[model samples]
Target chain A: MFSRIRLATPSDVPFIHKLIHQMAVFERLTHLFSATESGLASTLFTSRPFQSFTVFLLEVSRSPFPAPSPDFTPFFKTHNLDLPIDDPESYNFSPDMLNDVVVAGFVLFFPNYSSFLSKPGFYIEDIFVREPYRRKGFGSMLLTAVAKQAVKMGYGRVEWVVLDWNVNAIKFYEQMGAQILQEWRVCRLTGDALEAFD
Target chain B: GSMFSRIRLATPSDVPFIHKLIHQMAVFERLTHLFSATESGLASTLFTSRPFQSFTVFLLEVSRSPFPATFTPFFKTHNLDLPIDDPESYNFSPDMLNDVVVAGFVLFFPNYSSFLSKPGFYIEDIFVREPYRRKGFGSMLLTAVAKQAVKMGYGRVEWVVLDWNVNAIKFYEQMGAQILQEWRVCRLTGDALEAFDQVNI
Candidate 1:
């Protein structure tokens, strides 16, 4: 029942990777998905020695019932916790009960420069909470944590993009304090197209 | 050929040109209300004295060997920012006015993609003047950006186009840009950003 937001370590790459796929599927953007566990490790841990981006993980204890007898917080070798099902398990889509602890959600962001503002800003590349974990204000906590992170670092505004068809996300984000920039359209180049100009 | 063009990195001396282009780009996008940038803004962040620049920009210069008879009318109507119309009125030698014009420029910054696990260039502005459109100046600016991304070993290049600007969207697609039908930029700036604390996030 208790949850906390903390900076993710290298060992959390697998979970980060899994969470990204979940988000991609939810957004129907799996075709755009290319992140791997190792890539996440390289990007999150080693690249420029963590110079470029930030990843925050929200972890919660599934065993919050009956005063959580024994309060046995199981452990794994790394932050890659609870791969063990610990006996007869029923799961395909749920990571909630993997040895009484699991990653509920995470947010990945990076510093984006704003020349007009003459300062840098935070661009959330991805933010996601697990299924059944929705409607619990966890997403708000993650965004608030990021907003605070930006403010403490210096003058920074937060930005991200959403899908138009995602009316629910639009209303949710609007309620959360973001206005959809009406005059902008995301133009992207990747794969053969990105390299073609060369 | 009466005129040929080339692209180069912007220097502090180019700040005026950059400022003008920013205003012009804003005009073309019909989002001039959003532009509050000044030359000081461009100079301090873009042409910084610091170790890191906020972004990089490139200017497209169209150099004419000499003012051609057919091109004078074009310049008179379009190159209002240039001194070609009346060099003498501006106290310049007519003999020296062989026309090196800034047709356009591109401004871009590095952005990280967690999904791709890499860095990429995101062009904030890419513009060519009305007189300079359809002559491949825009393409050169875009190609220059792509080439830089390749040289830096970055993942890709990205930017945003207006939804109603079908011409610009088609122009981008011709040069390898995907008109992402789904993505819409979300922002919290000015008043919304100031009220960040009052809001949930």
Candidate 2:
């Protein structure tokens, strides 16, 4: 029973939508939750003018399964994931898993520019692990996968945000080699305030 | 600089200004040790190789001398993040110093909200020289970015300010930004980034 992290495909929209909602609940901003599966499919999976971000899915094998060999072709699929997606029964999960895996979490992130460094960095919009998957190293696995990707991609940094009151989380991230920027406060213009800006 | 100023997209002509101002920002933030950008870095990444509109950095240009533009206005003029300690280094332009001033600048790039499934404008840095602080140059730069976000139909315009920066916090509030107190920025740079090991961590 090993865990694997791979990119989310078009058929994962419904599950992704639920994962986003779970993230919202944990954030205690469920009041702001308004995403739909179809919307996610359109923006993230279907063809769009510009795609903004990608998601990584962390799944653990529920049964005994050996890790694939080096020549495994479907270790992680990033292409040929087009058309009429979304349905639990017809899901196209990795053949590597042999249909015996459970999704533990996901990571949503995208490229961001850093003017001072004059390099691109990765900005994680969200990283959520199912409650049942907590304390099982899923979180670290997901984050490390992203960090590894950034390192290989030559990105300058990987940035994200956390709620200050999440004291345990603060310590957890510290142990994982992340810095808590105490000086910076998150600011946003949204809703009427966003429109009224300027 | 002249009181009259305008905000416009930064150009290759501003390579020197962009290069030095970032260092000044590093000094202001007391993070000069982390400053790793070089003139050639910007020359290559921002001007030559990369397309102009890849990332937006707005430059605020002001006349070197005051003009008679009517009533006086702007800047509480706090001794903000000026490169007080290393002022000599950022005095980048001896030739244009007598004509115009790069009072301040704002750098932003496009970001997306997966929830909203729409693009957002995220300001990475907004800096103003000490002399230009009291004159509302910062606000003007912010306003310019906000205007662009609105024009582009972006769902939001977001950024971060130092927690101790009450003046900035207040000004951002005045511009209709809600400071999400509970949230904090998390960063992994330099050794922390390179040393990261999924299994080890």
Candidate 3:
């Protein structure tokens, strides 16, 4: 039987933080996170969160899954294809930007998840499983659950971004019938402009 | 040939021409949508002058036409992740600003994460005067921005256009750009904007 995954609560912040940290470290670019406890609280727990998002914690008695093995890493290590994981000089993780509660594994999410449409879909923003839990099917279980939830809620599709360089995840996602829409570049404004805005 | 002797930075005096270009661009992009662009709104926070590393603006001239043949503006954001030595990286100096004719123009913001959070350059505005078409000015300006972006140590340079603007889309592709097509830009505005303004207890 599938273990019952619970909705993340406010108290799960530290666990989430550590999980996030562990994920970042595993990716070998462990320094870019700048989230604070208060920052995460305000963003995830605000009257309106910064972005529409959610978390599902695996109710696991068994250990979780780990990142795909080293043999898979070399195939995904090309410029412009991989998400940057080696550039340690630019990663800056600060403690001040963390939330007080919540820990999630294989961090799966849909940013801007909304019920406003007739055929809504969830966009998985991030997914990471810690090192100790490799190949245990946690990754697939969460994804399957998300898909089931989307279907239950009348969603027409499930989508997310995968770094083109990361072939292991791509292979898994492709095996699961996920189509790679490799066309739209995600653009953004941040830093001073954000603080400058009222 | 006489010098182009064009104006450097756009001022209140340039709004009429700039607005004309904006509408033309919109139409060319097949925008059935209308926007409100009063002088003040055009020059408000979203368009105001920014002195921080967050933005950079410039208007250029060549020795021929009085009107600028092309306009290329780029902006920056602090990357807590970048190796910029607060002590050593080039500060936006007064001389640098004046030389770039900074005061005559204002900031242009790109509400994207790679733009806002990561330290990088995004070519927001690259327009060439109508008569100056096919003169390689656009490419030249783009090249200049690319050089500057690398010099500034930005990890990426990105821009966007309407998917229907086939010519512009093709032009960007010819310039060796990547077109990412799986996302839709979303906005929260009007009453939604108002709702966000109400203080929550």
Best by lDDT: 2
- Give the 10-residue window scoring lowest on summed lDDT in candidate 1 chain B: B68-77
lDDT of 3 at B108: 27
Candidate 3: residue B14 lDDT (0-100): 43
- Point out the higher-scoring one by DockQ: 2 or 3: 2
Q: Using DockQ as the measure, name the better of candidate 1 and candidate 3.
A: 1
Candidate 3 scores a chain A TM-score of 0.65
Local accuracy by lDDT, each model: 0.66, 0.67, 0.40
Q: Specify the CAPRI tier of model 2.
A: acceptable
lDDT of 1 by residue, A42-114 (tens): 7656432112467877766545422211211211111223344242222422345545566778888765666
Per-candidate DockQ values are 0.34, 0.43, 0.05
lDDT of 2 by residue, A1-198 (tens): 456676676777877877777788786877767667776776565321112366777766545334411211112211122232233532333334456566657888866667668777778888888775575567776677667767765678898988888999899889867898888888998778766653
Model 1: per-residue Cα lDDT over B102-129, one tens digit each: 7777877777765665578888777887
Q: Model 1: runs farther than 4 Å from truth?
A: A9-12, A25-32, A45-51, A60-102, A113-119, A152-157, B1-5, B11-17, B27-33, B38-44, B47-54, B61-103, B129-135, B152-155, B198-201
For B35-66, candidate 2 gives per-residue lDDT tens digits of: 88877767655542232224678887665355
Clashes of 1: 0
| lDDT (Cα, tens digit) per residue for candidate 3, span A1-198 | 113344444555555555666666765655666545454444346211112335555533222222111111100001122232232311122112232111225444542211112123455645665543345555555565555555434344565666667778677666655665554454432233222221
**Best TM-score among the predictions, by candidate number:** 2
Q: Least lDDT summed over 10 consecutive residues: which range in candidate 2 chain B?
A: B70-79
Docking class of 1: acceptable
Ordered by TM-score, highest first, the candidates read: 2, 1, 3
